[PDB]
Every structure is written in structure tokens, then in C-alpha cells.
Design a protein around this ligand. Sequence first.
Ligand SMILES: *[C@@H]1O[C@H](CO)[C@@H](O)[C@H](O)[C@H]1NC(C)=O
Ligand SMILES: *[C@@H]1O[C@H](CO)[C@@H](O)[C@H](O)[C@H]1NC(C)=O
Ligand SMILES: [Ca+2]
Ligand SMILES: [Ca+2]
Ligand SMILES: [Ca+2]
Ligand SMILES: [Ca+2]
Ligand SMILES: [Ca+2]
Ligand SMILES: [Ca+2]
Lengths: 33, 58, 116, 149
Amino acid sequence: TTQSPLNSFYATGTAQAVQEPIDVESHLDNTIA
Amino acid sequence: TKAVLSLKKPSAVIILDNDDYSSTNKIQLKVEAYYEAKEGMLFDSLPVILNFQVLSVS
Amino acid sequence: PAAGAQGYKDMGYVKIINYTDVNVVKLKVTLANAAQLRPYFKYLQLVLTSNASSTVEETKAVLSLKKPSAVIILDNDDYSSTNKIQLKVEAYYEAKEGMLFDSLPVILNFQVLSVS
Amino acid sequence: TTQSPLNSFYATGTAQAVQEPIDVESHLDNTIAPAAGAQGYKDMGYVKIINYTDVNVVKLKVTLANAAQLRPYFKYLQLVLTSNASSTVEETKAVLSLKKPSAVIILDNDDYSSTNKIQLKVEAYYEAKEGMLFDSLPVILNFQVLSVS
Ligand SMILES: *[C@@H]1O[C@H](CO)[C@@H](O)[C@H](O)[C@H]1NC(C)=O
Ligand SMILES: *[C@@H]1O[C@H](CO)[C@@H](O)[C@H](O)[C@H]1NC(C)=O
Ligand SMILES: [Ca+2]
Ligand SMILES: [Ca+2]
Ligand SMILES: [Ca+2]
Ligand SMILES: [Ca+2]
Ligand SMILES: [Ca+2]
Ligand SMILES: [Ca+2]
């Protein structure tokens, strides 16, 4: 004679974010002379 | 489509009937997600958990 | 993990043995030393899944430092090989910033509420 | 006739953390050696950063420790730091000076090439004081970790 609560069910996922939106690189190779 | 869950209204109630029980023994439900991430927040290994509870069976 | 890192780890499994004229067991699982572990962690979550039946894998409870106790049900489907339950533990954690330590135990307790 | 409480069951695990998130090694082996009062252009070297278990993103603060000592010897002095460890992504992260000695930089998944180290060279621009002669003067940089994940 056991009474159960009937709520022992689960499901699991994951998420992440490990980088910045943009990357910037420079090529200014001229001199104001 | 049976229910839509969100961070403001996390709970919903659905009904499964004779039409859903194909192969007479199982239900298949996929999950669809829409999201927008916070600005400038970096993280990893964060779990998302869903719970099920039976209210009535017949 | 390293100090202040966010991680993902598994621990092991626990065996349960059931005896004569027993069919259904109701159990309560809690974290015995949650108070001691508070200064060392921002958060720590444990996931318990029943696997002993190769056809039915089920997660039964999730434990945390804020809600350390849970109640689970084991029934005819779980008792594969008719004599034992296998439950592995899944851990998610984030360590405190700049805290160093070693040889710290984690303790779990079991109590029977009803058997039939 | 014995009554049992039915709670004599236990299971035990362990945990530990015995190292700091990062390790830093220096290879600054060049000398700023101009004439007195000259305006110049020089490079210095590079610095290595090592990242350890379960570390993905590091937030750092870099400052000039002995800026006050260097003031009487220079009219201005600027340091340029660039991340290069990824052969595809070269990025300048911060510029340090005697008036604004501190800066905050971010290192992410793209920077961690070879999965284990960061390479940062130092670029210097300077103008020496007029008629000042000296030798054996050190330049010191300091690192502090603000957050790791
Ligand atoms: C343990 O429970 C199972 C499943 O209900 C049952 O078949 C088995 O007989 C029980 N074991 C013993 C030793 O009675
Ligand atoms: C260092 O960080 C990189 C990039 O996020 C990661 O791939 C690597 O596993 C980390 N190193 C260690 C030893 O955990
Ligand atoms: Ca942290
Ligand atoms: Ca991590
Ligand atoms: Ca070290
Ligand atoms: Ca001059
Ligand atoms: Ca010149
Ligand atoms: Ca980047």
C-alpha cells in the first residue's frame, strides 16, 4: 500500500555562449608624410 | 502544437488522446526554441530542465 | 576544477538491493552536508537517472544546495535482473573565485518511507 | 522486538581545487636605448599566458606598476598590446600610457590557439627627456584576474 505523487519525470538540455559578436583586424599601412 | 512555454509563464496543461497514440504505445514530442541572449554575457555548461506531472488518467 | 571555473562532471553509480516479497519502494534522498559545502560553491546540482533497465532510462530527481531533498519512486520497470537498481550521479557546478582546498567529502543519505 | 528508523544508508564522494586559473611567463628581452631627447620607435618582446582545467574565458586587468618612477625620465611613453596567438586573428587589445596606466582586456575562445596558451607582444612609443642620462632602469607590468569562466 504505497501512495505515489506521480511527478518523478525530468528531461534536460544545455546551452552556451563562448565568443564575442565581432572580431576586428587592422591593415593601416600608410603614413601621412 | 500543444503548448508554448516561456520564462514569464512557465507552466502549461496538455491533453493526449486516441489520435496521438500512434503505434498504440508511444508519444513523440519535439521541442522548438526561440531565444535572445543577454548583451555581453559569456558562459558554458548551463542546463535546461523540464518536469512532468500526471493529473488524471483514464 | 580550477578555482572559479564552470564545469561538467560525472561521479559514479549506486547499487540498491531488494529482498523477499518486496515489489515497490518509496525513497527520500537528501544532501547531508549541504551547509558545509556552501562557502565553497556558488551552485551545485546533482542529477540522478535510473538506467538498470536497458530499455527505460529515466531521470528521477535533481538535487541542489537550495533544495537538498527529493522523493523518488521505484517500480516493476526499474527492477531489472529482478534484484538490483543502478543509479549514476550527474554533477553541475561552479567553484568560488580564488578558493583553494583539497580532501572535501560529499555525502548523500537514504531513508525508506514505504515499501510494498 | 526491535523498531528500526530505516535511515542508516550513506554514500560519499570527494572534490578538490589545488591550482590557480592562469600562469604567466615573461620574455621581454629588448631594451629601449635611444639618445638623450630623441623620439623613437621600438618593440620589446612577448608574454605567455597558460590556462588550466575547465577554463574558457578570462577577464584581466593590466597596469603600469612603476609609472611614478618613470615620470621624470620621459615626456610620454605608450605601450601597445596585441593578441597574435591565432595566426588568422591579430588584434590590438589595449594601449597603456603614463597618464592612463590601467586597462581591461578580454580573452575568448578565438584567442586560445593551441588550446593552451596566449601570446602577446608589447609595442612601445616614447620620447626621452632633454639632456637626461641614465642606465639600468626597469619597467614593470602587473596582472590581476577579475573573473574566469
Ligand atoms: C524485488 O522486486 C522485484 C520487482 O518488483 C521482484 O520481482 C523481486 O522478487 C524482488 N526481490 C525479492 C528478493 O523478493
Ligand atoms: C583553455 O581555454 C581553451 C579555450 O576556451 C579551452 O579549449 C581549454 O580546454 C582550456 N584549457 C584547459 C587546460 O582546460
Ligand atoms: Ca566564476
Ligand atoms: Ca568552463
Ligand atoms: Ca600556478
Ligand atoms: Ca626632444
Ligand atoms: Ca627620431
Ligand atoms: Ca573574439
